[PDB]
Amino acid sequence: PGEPVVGTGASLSVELGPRLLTSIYDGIQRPLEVIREKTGDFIARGVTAPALPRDKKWHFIPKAKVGDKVVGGDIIGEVPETSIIVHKIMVPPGIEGEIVEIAEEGDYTIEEVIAKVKTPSGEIKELKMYQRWPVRVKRPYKEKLPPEVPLITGQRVIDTFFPQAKGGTAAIPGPFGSGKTVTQHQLAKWSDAQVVIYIGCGERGNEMTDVLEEFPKLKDPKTGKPLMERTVLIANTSNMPVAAREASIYTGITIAEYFRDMGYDVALMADSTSRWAEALGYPAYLASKLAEFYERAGRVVTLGSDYRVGSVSVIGAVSPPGGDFSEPVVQNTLRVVKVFWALDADLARRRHFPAINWLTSYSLYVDAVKDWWHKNIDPEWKAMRDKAMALLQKESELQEIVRIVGPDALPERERAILLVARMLREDYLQQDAFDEVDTYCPPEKQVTMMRVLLNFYDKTMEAINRGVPLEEIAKLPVREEIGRMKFERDVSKIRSLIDKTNEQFEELFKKYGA
């Protein structure tokens, strides 16, 4: 319990230092299993739990020396916090000066002063391993960079057709706890963010027991260590006050921002259940509040003397009251988000996984990220996805028509388009999250699989143009290998299917002569 204050806040804050990681909180940063409150468009009050342990001892490694000039954001030491994440100790924003005192390498609890700064005025400021920040105020930076670098998820359909930029905003149908899809989980463990902030919301019956003691069992697939060691969990149980629940995304995003400020890429994942709020013109103003939340996502040049970049990418769950999706909460979210991954019950029923509707999803980041793909992975990345999408669009038009008149009148050419689009769906869009190889698809593998498919397309259309029956192309032996390539770990073996496709078709050009 702290001091009273007048005007849009009783100074609603969060603490930021060692032991944010592996920890489980509520909407206002009190630990696992803490109590009840009430709201205020002005003020709020609390009860009895802390946030970061004062008894715990941390190894502090000094990174600056007496006489160093420093600014807000400068890194003055390093604390090895889990086996995955080094915590970087930063001068809080608004503090500038000369370091007059700094702790030696040793072991200290968080309340110990580990540095002292003399400001230009002459005021001595005392620095600890943690800092406080008002959750409702965006934590500052030098510059918000334009969308440029993709957040690589390793999921083909997302990275290729509906990319997320680092610092970008994405929505997906919720709740995350839904067992109908596993993309939500793939996103958390595979995205190339070092740190994950997860706001598991609603959580009923067992949806707080799933998130209880299986997450401690969860392995981070990139290290073999527990995912919790690079995660901060924020819980929103149905038995929590609506004021803490409302506040949770501000607490979450502030902790995210705090990890960007160190130079980390951070993924913030916000769960949502049937109307997660009733606290906080009073339809339009809530919309405006949400925009501001989402506006705190971004990749930034951080505060500090060194040039340094970090990001918060936001993935928000969308779960309308009636499963309508013409409800306010979804239309509001979709007005601000740049990416929508349309999880589709009809795709799931057919067991097309991940169940992302390739016709109703969208990303506004394709142009933003193309240059990174072209320069680092493949100069044709963008021409290739466009081509594959145009194929999927055509297939969709054809299927509509064939719904009306049936398939018997299809020309060879249209049958070919359907054959190759089916291969695109089955061999590329579909991905096996339960397979030891296909659970992750590196960028290099993604473009090579695409070249294999599009080269098959080119060759199919050329062959048909020279009178090769489609039936003969449909049973080309390479097709079966193309269908299995998602399971191959050696990318050079996948690449070699290009020549193999080429020669096989030659054996067909020659079997038909002209």
Side-chain angles (χ1 to χ4, degrees):
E3 286 79 46
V5 171
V6 159
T8 191
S11 42
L12 243 150
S13 99
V14 76
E15 309 180 343
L16 308 164
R19 258 294 311 260
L20 275 171
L21 295 181
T22 77
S23 134
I24 309 167
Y25 297 114
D26 77 324
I28 65 176
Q29 208 210 191
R30 43 214 167 103
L32 28 91
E33 290 281 47
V34 186
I35 57 270
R36 279 72 234 173
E37 187 195 358
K38 238 296 165 198
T39 188
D41 338 309
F42 27 72
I43 278 98
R45 61 170 314 289
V47 203
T48 34
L52 271 47
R54 311 301 161 128
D55 63 278
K56 215 286 171 77
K57 277 205 174 180
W58 300 100
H59 191 75
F60 170 86
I61 299 167
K63 285 308 177 173
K65 66 182 190 290
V66 172
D68 284 339
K69 141 182 52 55
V70 302
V71 294
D74 268 334
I75 294 173
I76 55 166
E78 294 185 326
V79 174
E81 178 186 5
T82 69
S83 43
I84 307 169
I85 299 297
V86 180
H87 208 277
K88 313 292 183 145
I89 315 298
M90 303 171 299
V91 178
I95 294 180
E96 266 189 2
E98 160 184 335
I99 277 171
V100 290
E101 194 140 49
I102 189 157
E104 274 197 325
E105 184 179 8
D107 305 63
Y108 313 98
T109 71
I110 65 171
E111 294 279 18
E112 294 180 53
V113 174
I114 47 66
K116 290 185 189 171
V117 162
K118 181 200 291 151
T119 77
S121 219
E123 215 158 4
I124 306 283
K125 289 277 166 64
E126 290 188 341
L127 300 189
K128 299 165 165 176
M129 283 182 308
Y130 77 100
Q131 64 182 270
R132 290 179 190 85
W133 189 269
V135 304
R136 284 270 163 64
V137 174
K138 82 193 286 209
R139 159 173 269 268
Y141 49 83
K142 290 182 192 194
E143 186 186 330
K144 185 103 91 186
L145 294 171
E148 170 192 7
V149 178
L151 181 75
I152 296 298
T153 71
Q155 314 303 296
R156 284 189 288 276
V157 58
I158 295 174
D159 294 345
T160 313
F161 300 109
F162 313 111
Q164 162 79 302
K166 293 183 195 265
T169 54
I172 187 168
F176 288 149
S178 185
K180 256 141 189 73
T181 58
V182 296
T183 296
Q184 59 270 28
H185 315 88
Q186 290 292 86
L187 290 170
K189 45 185 176 77
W190 286 113
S191 295
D192 61 334
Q194 291 76 53
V195 171
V196 173
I197 309 315
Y198 199 94
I199 310 158
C201 226
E203 309 182 329
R204 193 86 168 271
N206 68 60
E207 225 270 282
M208 182 51 215
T209 323
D210 287 326
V211 182
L212 171 57
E213 209 71 14
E214 221 73 72
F215 265 90
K217 273 274 91 208
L218 240 302
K219 307 314 273 161
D220 164 44
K222 315 161 178 162
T223 64
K225 305 158 194 197
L227 185 60
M228 244 39 222
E229 289 188 46
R230 54 182 281 253
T231 324
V232 174
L233 213 65
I234 289 163
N236 280 356
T237 74
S238 185
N239 54 76
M240 275 165 184
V242 194
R245 283 172 59 92
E246 179 277 349
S248 57
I249 67 173
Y250 303 93
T251 299
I253 212 164
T254 305
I255 302 182
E257 283 173 350
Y258 168 76
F259 287 102
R260 45 134 242 237
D261 292 348
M262 314 178 195
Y264 284 131
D265 294 301
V266 184
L268 179 110
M269 301 190 58
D271 210 8
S272 170
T273 312
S274 314
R275 282 281 300 254
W276 100 93
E278 177 55 67
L280 165 75
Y282 214 73
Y285 170 81
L286 306 155
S288 202
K289 139 266 168 59
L290 189 57
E292 184 160 346
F293 162 75
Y294 275 108
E295 160 272 312
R296 294 170 66 167
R299 197 165 68 119
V300 307
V301 171
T302 76
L303 292 187
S305 295
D306 54 301
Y307 182 85
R308 186 162 95 211
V309 185
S311 57
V312 183
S313 316
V314 175
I315 307 172
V318 152
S319 193
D324 190 327
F325 288 88
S326 282
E327 291 293 87
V329 314
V330 41
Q331 280 153 321
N332 282 0
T333 297
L334 300 189
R335 189 154 55 233
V336 189
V337 300
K338 259 58 177 179
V339 176
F340 184 61
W341 297 315
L343 263 32
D344 178 304
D346 196 71
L347 249 17
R349 278 179 269 109
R350 308 166 110 101
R351 308 210 150 94
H352 178 292
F353 295 117
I356 291 162
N357 188 314
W358 55 96
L359 267 11
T360 61
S361 296
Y362 63 81
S363 163
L364 301 180
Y365 293 129
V366 172
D367 289 303
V369 306
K370 70 186 170 198
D371 192 71
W372 181 96
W373 284 94
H374 296 333
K375 173 202 230 147
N376 297 112
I377 318 297
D378 195 311
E380 331 272 79
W381 179 78
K382 167 81 156 73
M384 274 181 151
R385 50 102 53 228
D386 289 357
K387 185 155 166 189
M389 181 60 74
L391 206 17
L392 299 167
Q393 300 292 336
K394 173 76 196 206
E395 169 188 58
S396 166
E397 288 150 351
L398 281 173
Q399 288 177 329
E400 235 303 81
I401 288 157
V402 157
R403 201 182 55 68
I404 301 161
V405 315
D408 296 356
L410 258 13
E412 291 266 284
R413 172 177 147 106
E414 260 78 28
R415 289 170 76 239
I417 279 157
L418 291 175
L419 193 259
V420 184
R422 171 167 166 157
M423 293 163 66
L424 262 166
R425 287 165 28 227
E426 294 179 343
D427 308 347
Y428 196 89
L429 270 39
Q430 289 179 210
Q431 190 170 167
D432 192 352
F434 305 76
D435 183 75
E436 73 177 51
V437 171
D438 205 37
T439 193
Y440 186 76
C441 192
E444 199 205 335
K445 178 173 174 180
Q446 293 186 29
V447 298
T448 309
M449 290 176 63
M450 184 64 84
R451 310 189 70 117
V452 173
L453 284 157
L454 289 190
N455 186 64
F456 193 89
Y457 170 79
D458 293 344
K459 285 283 175 299
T460 296
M461 298 306 152
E462 179 195 322
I464 262 174
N465 210 246
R466 323 203 325 178
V468 173
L470 182 73
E471 302 64 48
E472 201 89 273
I473 299 153
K475 72 190 175 71
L476 220 42
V478 75
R479 275 201 58 207
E480 84 88 14
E481 294 181 283
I482 294 173
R484 297 185 287 109
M485 73 185 171
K486 72 181 81 185
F487 303 109
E488 176 52 62
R489 65 194 88 214
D490 187 345
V491 178
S492 79
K493 300 200 178 166
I494 303 170
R495 197 176 285 111
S496 85
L497 295 174
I498 291 168
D499 294 333
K500 190 154 189 201
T501 296
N502 287 354
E503 35 225 47
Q504 288 192 6
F505 266 94
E506 280 300 324
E507 299 186 38
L508 227 63
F509 289 148
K510 138 276 226 80
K511 193 197 159 173
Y512 285 89

